[PDB]
Design a protein around this ligand. Structure first.
Ligand SMILES: Nc1ncnc2c1ncn2[C@@H]1O[C@H](COP(=O)(O)OP(=O)(O)OP(=O)(O)O)[C@@H](O)[C@H]1O
Ligand SMILES: C/C1=C/C(=O)O[C@@H]2C[C@@H](CC[C@H](C)/C=C\CC1)O[C@@](O)([C@@H]1CSC(=O)N1)C2
Ligand SMILES: [Mg+2]
Lengths: 30, 364
């Protein structure tokens, strides 16, 4: 029941920066 | 213990408010998003109970808060009556619809601090919370509620706004359509109270066909799919192909005269607006959330339709948990109770310094 919290904590801690996501054209502001 | 270490989570739906305490598995309070004022104030179930002396309004339209005075009444009711808390004692997470305007999220922030004196707060996108509820930070969410349906692609926790799709076909429109097609079968439903009866019929008896044309043929070949339903006055009506024609509208919006592609195609369109590098990740993590995704058969239908649109070798997974009617709220409960999220709240001290616009640099 709480495995989800462990997983989310880990994934959120490992996330790339917004800058990286923009450089990869994943986030596209314009 | 509902103490000062416990955050609150409020999901502001067009139809239902879901509210409760972060860390709980389910919302403590679920009530209609309505406010009643004297004919010629009360909130939620009490407003409905006193409908004979009140006029009722929905403060949230297609997922967007539009009547702010009534929304403050809803929030006051939520804290004082439903949850029995002092909002000044709890960080408070509010939800917002995808693409919620800047001014709207600023006003939500302003009200929480200036009216309710919360010590901290955050505004999260509903679809992102649903993804989090499944333990994921990447995927594409189909969130279909009472007032609006969205396809929201999300990568590493960030919604990708350029690729978000909005469809103003959702549960309330499906109820209205069921009223129409039941009327065709002989059974007249038109008034506000009758619409509530039909909403109940929809929730209890409707389903999504895997193969619509084959299901129509099955319904015509015998009475095997027919169901009886007793109205409040004791009359018993029969429902047949209306059971699946109603939610078929999600896949064929032309049923109600809308030109939009159906939810499978909007899912595909949203994916195709995202970079090809994350494509496999989106197809492998299609999360369905919201009350209008509760139809039996809808996950299998989506699996089939997405399979038909995607490349032949693409791995497709539809995630549609039994708890998905509350997964926005549940995702909020999870997020707001994580130790590593505590640094993310907008604090009252930060708000004091920066004002409402701080929401754009803290919440996304
Ligand atoms: N078992 C069910 N089958 C079909 N529809 C259902 C079922 N249960 C609830 N619904 C519908 O889901 C809707 C409510 O869902 P939900 O609480 O996700 O919406 P909301 O968050 O208030 O709305 P929105 O997100 O569109 O602003 C109602 O239209 C309701 O009739
Ligand atoms: C039982 C519960 C279901 C619901 O989803 O309720 C929400 C909120 C509700 C508000 C009016 C109603 C008279 C009040 C109480 C119903 C609340 O309107 C809805 O029923 C509307 C009207 S019919 C349609 O399916 N959605 C959805
Ligand atoms: Mg919702």
């Amino acid at each position: 029941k709480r495995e989800i919290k462990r997983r989310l904590t880990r994934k959120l801690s490992q996330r790339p920066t917004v800058e990286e996501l923009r450089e990869r054209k994943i986030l596209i502001r314009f | 213990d509902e103490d000062e270490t416990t955050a609150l989570v409020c999901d502001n739906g067009s139809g239902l408010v879901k509210a409760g305490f972060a860390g709980d598995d389910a919302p403590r309070a679920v009530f209609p998003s309505i406010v009643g004022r004297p004919r010629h104030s009360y909130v939620g179930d009490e407003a409905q109970s006193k409908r004979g002396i009140l006029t009722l309004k929905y403060p949230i339209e297609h997922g967007i808060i539009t009547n702010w005075d009534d929304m403050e009444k809803i929030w006051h009711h939520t804290f004082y009556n439903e949850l029995r808390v002092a909002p000044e004692e709890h960080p408070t997470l509010l939800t917002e619809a995808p693409l919620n305007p800047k001014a709207n999220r600023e006003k939500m922030t302003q009200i929480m601090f200036e009216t309710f004196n919360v010590p901290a707060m955050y505004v999260a996108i509903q679809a992102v919370l649903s993804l989090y509820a499944s333990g994921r930070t990447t995927g594409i969410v189909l969130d279909s509620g009472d007032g609006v349906t969205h396809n929201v692609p999300i990568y590493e926790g960030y919604a990708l706004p350029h690729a978000i799709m909005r469809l103003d076909l959702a549960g309330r429109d499906l109820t209205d359509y069921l009223m129409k097609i039941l009327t065709e079968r002989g059974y007249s439903f038109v008034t506000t109270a009758e619409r509530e009866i039909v909403r109940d019929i929809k929730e209890k008896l409707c389903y999504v066909a895997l193969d619509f044309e084959n299901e129509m043929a099955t319904a015509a070949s015998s009475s095997s799919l027919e169901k009886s339903y007793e109205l409040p006055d004791g009359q018993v009506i029969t429902i047949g192909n209306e059971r699946f024609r109603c939610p078929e509208t999600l896949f064929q919006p032309s049923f109600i005269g809308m030109e939009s592609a159906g939810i499978h195609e909007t899912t595909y369109n949203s994916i195709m607006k995202c970079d090809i590098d994350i494509r496999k990740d989106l197809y492998a993590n299609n999360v369905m959330s919201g009350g209008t995704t509760m139809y039996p058969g809808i996950a299998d239908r989506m699996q089939k339709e997405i399979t038909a649109l995607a490349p032949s070798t693409m791995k497709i997974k539809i995630i549609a948990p039994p708890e998905r009617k509350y997964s926005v709220w549940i995702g909020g409960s999870i997020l707001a109770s994580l130790s590593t999220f505590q640094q993310m709240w907008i604090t009252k001290q930060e708000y004091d310094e920066a004002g409402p616009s701080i929401v754009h640099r803290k919440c996304f």
